[PDB]
Design an enzyme around this catalytic site. Sequence first.
Site, PDB file in Angstrom:
ATOM      1  N   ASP A 113    -103.592  17.687 -47.912  1.00 26.85           N
ATOM      2  CA  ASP A 113    -103.496  18.933 -46.352  1.00 26.85           C
ATOM      3  C   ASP A 113    -103.112  20.478 -46.610  1.00 26.85           C
ATOM      4  O   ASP A 113    -103.385  20.931 -46.070  1.00 26.85           O
ATOM      5  CB  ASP A 113    -102.626  18.564 -46.066  1.00 26.85           C
ATOM      6  CG  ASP A 113    -102.191  16.460 -45.749  1.00 26.85           C
ATOM      7  OD1 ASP A 113    -102.018  16.258 -44.985  1.00 26.85           O
ATOM      8  OD2 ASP A 113    -100.637  16.255 -46.201  1.00 26.85           O
ATOM      9  N   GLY A 114    -103.721  20.421 -48.497  1.00 29.00           N
ATOM     10  CA  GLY A 114    -104.442  22.094 -48.239  1.00 29.00           C
ATOM     11  C   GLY A 114    -103.911  22.626 -49.961  1.00 29.00           C
ATOM     12  O   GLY A 114    -103.915  21.176 -50.603  1.00 29.00           O
ATOM     13  N   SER A 138    -102.771  25.800 -46.109  1.00 29.19           N
ATOM     14  CA  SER A 138    -101.664  24.360 -45.430  1.00 29.19           C
ATOM     15  C   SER A 138    -102.079  24.413 -44.040  1.00 29.19           C
ATOM     16  O   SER A 138    -101.779  24.819 -42.681  1.00 29.19           O
ATOM     17  CB  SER A 138    -100.233  25.089 -45.415  1.00 29.19           C
ATOM     18  OG  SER A 138     -99.563  24.540 -45.169  1.00 29.19           O
ATOM     19  N   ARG A 139    -103.007  22.823 -44.216  1.00 31.48           N
ATOM     20  CA  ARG A 139    -103.160  22.714 -43.214  1.00 31.48           C
ATOM     21  C   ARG A 139    -101.955  22.565 -42.167  1.00 31.48           C
ATOM     22  O   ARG A 139    -102.232  22.547 -41.001  1.00 31.48           O
ATOM     23  CB  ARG A 139    -103.757  21.505 -43.101  1.00 31.48           C
ATOM     24  CG  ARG A 139    -105.221  21.209 -43.410  1.00 31.48           C
ATOM     25  CD  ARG A 139    -106.161  19.960 -43.728  1.00 31.48           C
ATOM     26  NE  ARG A 139    -107.126  19.672 -44.462  1.00 31.48           N
ATOM     27  CZ  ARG A 139    -107.296  20.069 -45.580  1.00 31.48           C
ATOM     28  NH1 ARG A 139    -106.726  20.415 -45.820  1.00 31.48           N
ATOM     29  NH2 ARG A 139    -108.121  20.065 -46.012  1.00 31.48           N
ATOM     30  N   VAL A 140    -100.551  22.018 -42.119  1.00 33.69           N
ATOM     31  CA  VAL A 140     -99.549  21.972 -41.709  1.00 33.69           C
ATOM     32  C   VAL A 140     -98.664  23.022 -41.123  1.00 33.69           C
ATOM     33  O   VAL A 140     -98.792  22.985 -39.843  1.00 33.69           O
ATOM     34  CB  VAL A 140     -98.135  20.899 -42.497  1.00 33.69           C
ATOM     35  CG1 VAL A 140     -96.931  21.274 -41.589  1.00 33.69           C
ATOM     36  CG2 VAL A 140     -98.727  19.477 -42.740  1.00 33.69           C
TER      37      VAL A 140
END
Lengths: 276, 138, 138, 261, 260, 260, 122
Positions: A113-114, A138-140
Amino acid sequence: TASDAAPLQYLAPYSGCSMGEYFRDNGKHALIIYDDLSKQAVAYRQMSLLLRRPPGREAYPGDVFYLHSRLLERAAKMNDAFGGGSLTALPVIETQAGDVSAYIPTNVISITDGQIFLETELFYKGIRPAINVGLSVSRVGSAAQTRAMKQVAGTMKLELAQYREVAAFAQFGSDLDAATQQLLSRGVRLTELLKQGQYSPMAIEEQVAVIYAGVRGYLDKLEPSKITKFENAFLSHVISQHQALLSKIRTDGKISEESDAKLKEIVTNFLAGFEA
Amino acid sequence: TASDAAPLQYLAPYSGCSMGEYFRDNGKHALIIYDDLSKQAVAYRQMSLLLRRPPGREAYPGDVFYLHSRLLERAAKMNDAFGGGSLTALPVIETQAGDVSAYIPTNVISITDGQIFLETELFYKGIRPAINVGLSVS
Amino acid sequence: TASDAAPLQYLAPYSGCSMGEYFRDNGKHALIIYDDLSKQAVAYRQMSLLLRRPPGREAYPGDVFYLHSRLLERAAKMNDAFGGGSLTALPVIETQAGDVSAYIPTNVISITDGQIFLETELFYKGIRPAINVGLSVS
Amino acid sequence: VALVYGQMNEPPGARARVALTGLTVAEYFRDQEGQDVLLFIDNIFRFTQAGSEVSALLGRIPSAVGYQPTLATDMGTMQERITTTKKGSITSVQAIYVPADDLTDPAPATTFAHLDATTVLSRAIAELGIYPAVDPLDSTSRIMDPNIVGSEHYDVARGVQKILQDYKSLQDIIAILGMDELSEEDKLTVSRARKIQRFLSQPFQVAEVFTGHLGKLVPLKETIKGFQQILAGEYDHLPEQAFYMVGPIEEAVAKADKLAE
Amino acid sequence: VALVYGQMNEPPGARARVALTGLTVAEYFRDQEGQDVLLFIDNIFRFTQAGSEVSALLGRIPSAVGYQPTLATDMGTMQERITTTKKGSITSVQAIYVPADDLTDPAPATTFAHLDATTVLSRAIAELGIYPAVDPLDSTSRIMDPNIVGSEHYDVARGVQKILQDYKSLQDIIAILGMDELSEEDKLTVSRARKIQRFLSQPFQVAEVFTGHLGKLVPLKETIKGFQQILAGEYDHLPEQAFYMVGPIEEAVAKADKLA
Amino acid sequence: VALVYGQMNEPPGARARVALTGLTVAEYFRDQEGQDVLLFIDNIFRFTQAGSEVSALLGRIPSAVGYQPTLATDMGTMQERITTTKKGSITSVQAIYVPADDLTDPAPATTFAHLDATTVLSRAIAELGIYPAVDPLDSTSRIMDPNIVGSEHYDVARGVQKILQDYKSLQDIIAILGMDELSEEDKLTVSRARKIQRFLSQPFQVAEVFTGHLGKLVPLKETIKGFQQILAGEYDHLPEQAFYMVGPIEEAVAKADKLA
Amino acid sequence: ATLKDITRRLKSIKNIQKITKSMKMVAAAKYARAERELKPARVYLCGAIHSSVAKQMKLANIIYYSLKESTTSEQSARMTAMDNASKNASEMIDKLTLTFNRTRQAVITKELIEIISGAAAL
């Protein structure tokens, strides 16, 4: 370790994963660090080739991508219906000469996710931890930041991106306008605030108090060479004398208009003290 | 030479070496020039692949280092107890695009007691011999 | 086309050529357009890697130049004693990033009797046909 | 000192084992006597090249760069014995060859993890006449910790590295665009860097045949101090050359005069 | 929408075929019900990669850069099923990942062989607040040919871009030497360009549950007219913000009213 | 003249042997008639390529770049018959096609060692319009010895190369910043180098249809001379263009008048 | 060429191009100021500036003249010059990147072909 047979080095990450799953499944939270996925890939490649399976790029078997994806997917946030428990994973990949596109670094980047990208040039230039803030991701994102942090993180992220545009000019800026000359200054101070010694992780409330200091402009007239000293002492001071404001920030989860004003005074008097 | 069978080209260095040890082992002094060890490696590579021995790095046998170490270790200075004779070797290796870091070039630079590196830049510039002071050593 | 087995894409140009040859062979005049020889080359390479033939420069099999010379040698101008007929070939080759030194482009330049290089720069700048008048030749 | 040898004139096999023999001798003094051993191996790469040389005859598909597929494990079961334990202590100094000068080569590359300190030498530095040719920005030690060597040691080291890095970045640029446009702030770091670059060289006592200079051994405090002062601007007047091939900082000052004419 | 998934944990063969499965579904709404279906393959690179994994497993010698020998056919047998037949048509929006930022890498290079247009989403544009954040100068299309979209369409489009290009030039000047050596002419290209940039943004009905604003589906006719007139000089008096996040030019007019 | 041919349309084996065939014809005149022969071959690279075509079929593990492991010996037992001897003389001129322009290619790479003189042609030079596109710092000849061409020749020759080598190193900087920042002295090498570079070009009868000029044949002493003067600064006043595409220096002076 | 060699130049020509670009924006600035201040005064790495005077080289009222002029011409000159320097650096960053990717690719194929070659000879 190094002298353990390939298959044990291969398995290690799964057997550690299971252990962390027991927590995840039981409404508990667990963190897992795979150090490194590069060495395990090697262990797997070694068995694959000795069993004579077909070799692809870098001599890796066609199922090396599947070895990590099936591992890194077992990390997840469950639903209350399932216990709300979680498994966060920090997998480490060792690049070579910064070749983030080599085979294994490409798979794992593509799965997660990153990425937190570290760089030697940064490291030796004094930025420690060596995080390359422009390429890290950070995709989140904020879906995971606290409101306190966001309250500050957000403008910092932005002046930095802005500095990054102009940074290169600095060293030859024989006559830049005060507009951009401003961003160079915010640039170097904000950067000095991101520095950090090891083995001393901070409480989210301590991080926002310090970030607030430069982000708000308080260290703009301070010397780059001193920000490290400032923070240290400034933070020593509020961790000593002001544990009630930090407790607020903490609790209220954000920077109230009040605590905002209290911090203003705390830093404008400390700074005065500081340059005496 | 060029039309001699690969195995002759391959052997040639060891042959010549042995003729030099005669002098070395008898308190006399010999000097041998291996011109060049690049074409021999090719010969070795050919002979070797035709024997069906799996090719290695750059297509050469996994033992090309060994091919030259074995040979050049023979150049030596014997003590008075053995005649005090000696064998001095001046092997030649051809680089491409002046790249001395190349695998073969370094394989051989890591066996001898120094190197004389000649650059075409220096040569054209008037510096002949084109010895590159900085990169050559003894 | 894009969906036919590689062997058919590979074959296609030879067939069209034979059809152009009827005209050449009978005092008539034909024009053949191979669009593109780039993709035929990758079709033939797929065949060659699947047959297990040693991949060489750009993984292309050793005989891809012949894949093309044989084909383009057939375009030709016969003399009167053979009909005076003729076959004209305008084969197409797709370069990547204007790189005209690649293996395939070079191969083909070393076969035909000139080239017409179209430039992307020219094309956007509004010069169309995007011909590069200095580089192109007949 | 006990000695064990399996040189370059030996068949792969001997070369794939001498290190073992050597290491075995050393483990005895570590365990059966409990002593403080000093282990020198030159060159451990040879153990790995030995293996790659018979590998194909052992019927194996090659891994990348020609190496055998068992390189890392082969290296692991060996490197893991070369170690200090509670019984005895080993201080191993291993020379590590770097094929084609490429530090990413599977062998040199695979060995970093087995070390606590690494001295990386570079032909680019050597080429300039700077010996020992250590690369100041690619050498590391697990004890370069303020908690272990102290902050004076630590701030100097990092201080020296920042400036050499700072200068590395400018190198390619003043190369073309020249130096005039540079800020006096930045042409001072070019200065100090070039002097440090030199102050880092030293005439070894085992290379007088090479340097034509008497070997100097400098004590840790003479080092820390010398650099501390260069970094402090305390010698911006002496010439770079005064700092080349000398021991302690005082020799750089003396050499300035000798050069003064 | 019907969702077809080939998750990253699935073996090569599965992530290999799932784009075909999705294809199968779409072909139905075309060959059985003659609609105009939309096919979304996210992302087209993982298709190709799945191809290589499968290939390697079947022990076939990789070709240039390690991809499959059959890279071009694996792609063609799939891409070609995406078209307009007499019954209907499937249109595919393919998310592309370019390896090593290398547009001549075999994966990407092969892929462009089939593309008729690119939709470049841009973080820079987004930062202007402009959304959709599509880049008007980097995005492209094969059918932007007067012989295909018609001279009018073609000219407006080429009008919008040049102006957007010119303004780009001036952008450097403005910031440094300040916004005024600017000509009665240079000051108009900017004005309009800035109006245009905004007129190119728009409210989506998908984001109504969130923007508290009403989505707009502007028609092609309305689109060409809109920009036609701004180019024309019909709304030079209107103010920038009149054009931000609206549908048809008519709304640019009315917003101006409410903006006094 | 005797002609032997095995062209681009033959199967590999024919191309692999015609050289031997032309070769044999030549050997007859040399040894059986003690004749002075001239042997032209276009292109000897094709013989090696032919070899690489059949090599897999003969079942051999390939060497580097897919070539046959017997590349050098095959070139060798063939190249070694193309030679002058005590019985007869063979002056041989062989064209050597360089694949992808890579002179490090096993084929061309292995051929250098068999020549006494080499003329390395360059695309870069050709593209500048200099013909023949000979690379002056890459062509060599075992006769370039003072004791063979005379020191006058030997000193002009090394003179020309030294100035072109010098120009060559300045080029990197000239490339970003042009000549402005150059030293008065450095700019004179540059002037002279660019005039020497142009004077090295020349019109061939055979290429008249393309140069648009009448072919020229310059006598050695005219070459030694014309180059001396240039070196010696006797034409620092003429423009470069005066030197392009001419025979003798005397024509370069004239062209200068015509250029006015 | 070595990816590491090519990445050095690229690394550096990318910088030189941004420096050079920055120096022009400055040169334009000063040159703005100058064309104005120039107006009045007539009613009374800089390109080929210092040299042009240098070659041809071998009060107050006019001193401020030759000065007030020689600065418009200079800040003019530096401006265009640095304008083309980044124009040159850009053609190179685009040129080197292509050499970088041809090599990058070539290195990967060359290796695999070596492996495949050795595997196949068993």
